[PDB]
Design a protein around this ligand. Sequence first.
Ligand code: HEM
Ligand code: HEM
Ligand SMILES: [C-]#N
Ligand SMILES: [C-]#N
Ligand SMILES: [Cl-]
Lengths: 152, 152
Amino acid sequence: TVFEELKRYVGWGDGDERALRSLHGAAAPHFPRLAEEFYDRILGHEGARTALVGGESQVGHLKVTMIAWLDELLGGPWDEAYWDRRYRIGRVHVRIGLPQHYMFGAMNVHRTGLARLAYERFHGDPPELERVRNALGKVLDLELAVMLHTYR
Amino acid sequence: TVFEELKRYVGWGDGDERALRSLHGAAAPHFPRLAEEFYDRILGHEGARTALVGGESQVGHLKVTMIAWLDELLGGPWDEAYWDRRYRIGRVHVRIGLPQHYMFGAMNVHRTGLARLAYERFHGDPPELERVRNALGKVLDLELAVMLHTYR
Ligand code: HEM
Ligand code: HEM
Ligand SMILES: [C-]#N
Ligand SMILES: [C-]#N
Ligand SMILES: [Cl-]
């Protein structure tokens, strides 16, 4: 019952779902750049770069799937079907033997870029920036929770 | 070496340490409120609440160590001794049999309250808010990384 238990813990509601869909509007034009920053960080890092051995075409294909990951992250819905898909995504990284600690590093790159886009779009309406900032934190902490469940 | 590999991944530097120290002075007066918010979430959650059956003194003592936990989070330093203390804290929770996913729910409560406090203090200086918000996301993500290393 992991996503169900944590939605309750963090106070997930319709309000968070609206806020993320508002953020999708602002962020989606920038998904290619966020994917770019994400693989740049992996390819810049001595330990993490050893996970990516398929070459020039592999990063191109992973950028395509990361763009779709982002699009689902912000657009939803965030029902059982969505979270079961996130479980399988966790298991993929488990099966390639990626060390779990890299998942927190990688999610931090998305967290930082997405927090920046949110500020840039919503700073003029502080109460909507707060709703959007709060939802973003929740969805990213639940993604980490679900992906790290698969490592157990 | 979770802390050291991951610190390079997220770009942890002297500037993150300065941003968090700057927030400390603003946020410290609110640590009692944050601690209250943290415990009220545990007590309102059907699964998590059963870990607090040691009475009003158990909750009172946990509040004290949580205010110390927050003071260290934002005050530092973030050295080998710090991160060793964080491993030990992680192990406490493994030892008492707390489901690992609750660590993500609980951390989200602090992330939400601390992100509001950073905005409140730094929103008249958007480049400083940027540094503080980035440092806060990093430190919480590293904390989760170390905590969940202990659950392996
Ligand atoms: C926020 C963190 C991450 C997310 C959201 C993420 C997401 C994804 C997604 C959606 C897929 C496609 C799975 C499928 O085919 O359906 C995937 C595959 C993959 N990811 Fe990640 N990933 C993350 C972290 C990492 C990291 C840190 C690395 C390496 C440093 C990595 C390397 C890979 C590789 C190599 C594959 C392909 C595996 C294979 O097909 O053999 N990922 N990831
Ligand atoms: C961000 C998440 C959390 C942090 C930072 C945190 C921090 C701490 C700290 C610093 C201690 C003190 C260890 C010591 O006395 O040396 C502790 C103990 C404890 N925590 Fe947490 N904690 C978290 C999540 C949780 C959750 C979700 C629960 C329960 C639902 C919980 C229940 C406890 C209990 C029962 C103890 C005391 C165990 C004993 O009697 O020895 N904590 N925590
Ligand atoms: C992972 N791409
Ligand atoms: C745990 N307090
Ligand atoms: Cl903000």
